[PDB]
Design an enzyme around this catalytic site. Structure first.
Site, PDB file in Angstrom:
ATOM      1  N   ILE B  83      42.355  36.694  39.159  1.00 49.87           N
ATOM      2  CA  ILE B  83      41.706  35.442  37.940  1.00 49.87           C
ATOM      3  C   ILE B  83      41.678  35.494  36.606  1.00 49.87           C
ATOM      4  O   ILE B  83      40.827  36.715  35.837  1.00 49.87           O
ATOM      5  CB  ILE B  83      40.611  35.441  38.713  1.00 49.87           C
ATOM      6  CG1 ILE B  83      40.505  34.917  40.258  1.00 49.87           C
ATOM      7  CG2 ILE B  83      39.887  33.226  37.271  1.00 49.87           C
ATOM      8  CD1 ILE B  83      38.978  34.879  40.104  1.00 49.87           C
ATOM      9  N   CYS B  84      42.717  34.639  35.755  1.00 52.27           N
ATOM     10  CA  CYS B  84      42.803  34.755  34.180  1.00 52.27           C
ATOM     11  C   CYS B  84      41.655  33.711  33.925  1.00 52.27           C
ATOM     12  O   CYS B  84      41.800  32.392  34.138  1.00 52.27           O
ATOM     13  CB  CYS B  84      44.295  34.002  34.044  1.00 52.27           C
ATOM     14  SG  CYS B  84      44.201  34.149  31.946  1.00 52.27           S
TER      15      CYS B  84
END
Ligand SMILES: [K+]
Ligand SMILES: [Zn+2]
Ligand SMILES: [Zn+2]
Lengths: 77, 146
Positions: B83-84
């Site tokens: 997840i960015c």
């Protein structure tokens, strides 16, 4: 400088299953230090561990710390 | 780290997040699992998404590692479930609860940050054809999240 937990603070933290005086970063030590200008309370070793970890500013808001005031929180009971 | 992880588990029992849950897997307090309901306001609506949460030994001075298990179509989340999200790296602060992390992930499902993408081709579609992005996201939700 002594800070006394109020009754409403005591009720609030009870409802949340905790105490006002507990440092919410470590959940182990009581809050011994007030950071300025923001006013966030925590224990000193959490401040120290934060900086030791390369963390920037206040451990809560990451704002510049312009001051650190020692404090003592007196539990409500 | 134990005392903080312990309070996090209590906090989730006291105040269960909306459409989110998390807790340890078996006997290991440092590996948790989470579930997120696809927000109703997004293309993920109706989906149930599973995540892993790994707390490092220096938590909470370092962020927990959070990743999707469930496959998802999204500019900021890759095929490995990485997840960015800024609060999970440069914007982390020790005072963030697991509850706030999960809610931030839900906000990210509603409103992607395509200019800081993990999957450029998906970000490109999001920036250009939004109706198409929505269409594909729903199909992936329907396929893997239901
Ligand atoms: K515990
Ligand atoms: Zn502390
Ligand atoms: Zn602060």
């Amino acid at each position: 400088d002594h800070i006394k937990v109020t009754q409403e603070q005591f009720e609030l933290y009870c409802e949340m299953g905790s105490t006002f005086q507990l440092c919410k970063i470590c959940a182990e030590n009581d809050k011994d230090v007030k950071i300025e200008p923001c006013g966030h309370l925590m224990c000193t070793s959490c401040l120290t561990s934060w900086q030791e970890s390369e963390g920037q500013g206040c451990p809560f808001c990451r704002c510049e710390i312009k001051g650190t005031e020692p404090i003592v929180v007196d539990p409500f009971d | 780290a134990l005392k903080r992880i312990h309070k996090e588990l209590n906090d989730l029992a006291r105040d269960p997040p909306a459409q989110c849950s998390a807790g340890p897997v078996g006997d290991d307090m440092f590996h948790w699992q989470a579930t997120i309901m696809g927000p109703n306001d997004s293309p993920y609506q109706g989906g149930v998404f599973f995540l892993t949460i790994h707390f490092p030994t220096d938590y909470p001075f370092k962020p927990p590692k959070v990743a999707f298990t469930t496959r998802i179509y999204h500019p900021n989340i890759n095929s490995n479930g990485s997840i960015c999200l800024d609060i999970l790296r440069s914007q982390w602060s020790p005072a963030l609860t697991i509850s706030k992390v999960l809610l931030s992930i839900c906000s990210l499902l509603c409103d992607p940050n395509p200019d800081d993408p993990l999957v450029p081709e998906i970000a490109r579609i999001y920036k250009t054809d939004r109706e198409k992005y929505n269409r594909i996201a729903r199909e992936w939700t329907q396929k893997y999240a239901m």
